[PDB]
Design a protein around this nucleic acid. Structure first.
Length: 10
DNA sequence: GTCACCGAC
């Protein structure tokens, strides 16, 4: 996720 | 986080 908690995705 | 397979903590 994010960053934080990438994306999704990448 | 939650998948797509990458991201970039």
């Amino acid at each position: 996720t994010x960053p934080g908690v990438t994306x999704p995705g990448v």
